[PDB]
Assembly symmetry: C3
Homo-oligomer: 160 residues x 3
């Protein structure tokens, strides 16, 4: 069994007027937000896919499909907790996590420590090993036109 | 010499009507496929670039250029096998691999284990350390309009 | 404290006619270049964000904001040197770095070793652990239309 396992997640959602903008569990006010079947939490979904992928498990759509055992309107916290449980039972913990959010507007930096603490609380990890940064998309393509929001996560898992 | 080496690959191809859609060696039927000089295998090309990049070698275009030693119409398997040979001679093996495919349509999940087994066979690695997930692009930009397909790979290499 | 720390950076800039194209400190002639408040160095900025992110520090905009202590027209070298200082004081060094540049035109490969040596010089790392590759964007979206340039970096940091 491997002492370290590397994961990558990506997620993108459409932003449309009058919808919720929820990032890592945190509500951020804005003229646009995520139009999705989920709660639209691009950061939470791609952290989940990074964990699942580091471990070689089925992906977020395979584990939590559109069709009930118990999902459909689950808060993204539900998917984060199930992913850390499966990680734990596989014999791994979080070494560190680095997420990049791509978002034209609004500014994420004022909410950053609030996001990091909530994401850390849900992962059961120390905030000193869970990181998030943000970037605009320079007014080009859908992301730049604020017609979408994307997140990348790279994660390094450690054998317990 | 370093016990671990990290790599990242990215590739994107145009999708046009009536072309082959080949992903990780596997044929997937679809109204569009890759218009390319390669066989268009976005997953295979970006795994190759992740390996090459983890090792600090020239990239896929530098190692396998348009101009014969022996390439031009090589199946992407040829590039995967040459990359694992160069990795081996550098003194490394695969720790784990996590690839993300971005594709609006069709659905990749039914073909997933078939893709993973073929990619594992070509890498000479166990399927339990080679992972692939897929994501739509929410109907935005070329990827969302099914006018292209992209792949990211993060890889962690281990010293033998 | 963790023996290894993983980082990811992303950056994108607009390309417009008659501007400088500077990549990893190196001038590359071209009919378009980066229109930015920075020197526009997408590779240098995203290496900085990968380092900062691996360490869990504030991001490039938070550490080097628009408002003087001493920035505003700093060459991107200034940000690279401050990032390696903060890495050093945190007790880390570079294990390896793999950057991917996405650029339709011009061709980066002829300048590649020049870029790698300059980036290595600024990081205080050996060129054998600092890697860069390049990719087109297949004539689609802003990147494909040469209306922008993007860079991804994955980095693995080692405890001293
Ligand atoms: N081309 C694709 C795109 C997505 N998928 C699957 O659909 C799920 C949902 O993807 P989206 O959130 O992008 O809709 C993914 O997590 C994956 O299981 C797929 O199987 N083939
Ligand atoms: N701006 C760019 C884009 C690509 N390239 C080189 O061209 C090769 C082929 O890139 P594409 O498959 O994107 O055409 C790359 O693997 C790289 O060697 C480059 O040298 N400069
Ligand atoms: N949505 C966003 C986008 C960027 N930012 C911040 O602004 C800085 C500059 O981002 P750009 O270079 O993309 O303009 C980032 O490094 C980050 O500190 C943010 O706080 N919220
Ligand atoms: Cl804006
Ligand atoms: Cl669709
Ligand atoms: Cl071109
Ligand atoms: Zn999502
Ligand atoms: Zn390709
Ligand atoms: Zn920048």
């Amino acid at each position: 069994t491997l002492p370290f396992r590397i994961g990558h997640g990506f997620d993108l959602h459409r932003l449309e007027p009058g919808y919720p903008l929820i990032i890592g569990g945190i509500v951020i006010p804005h003229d646009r937000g995520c139009e999705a079947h989920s709660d639209g939490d691009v950061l939470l979904h791609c952290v989940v896919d990074a964990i699942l992928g580091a471990l070689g498990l089925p992906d977020i759509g395979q584990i939590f499909p559109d069709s009930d055992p118990k999902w459909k309107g689950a808060a993204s916290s539900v998917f984060i907790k199930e992913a850390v449980r499966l990680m734990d039972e596989a014999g791994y913990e979080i070494g560190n996590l680095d997420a990049t959010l791509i978002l034209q507007r609004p500014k994420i930096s004022p909410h950053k420590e609030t996001i990091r603490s909530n994401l850390s609380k849900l992962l059961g990890a120390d905030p000193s090993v869970v990181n998030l940064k943000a970037k605009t998309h320079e007014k080009v393509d859908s992301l730049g036109e604020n017609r979408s929001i994307a997140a990348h996560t790279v994660i390094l898992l450690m054998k317990k």
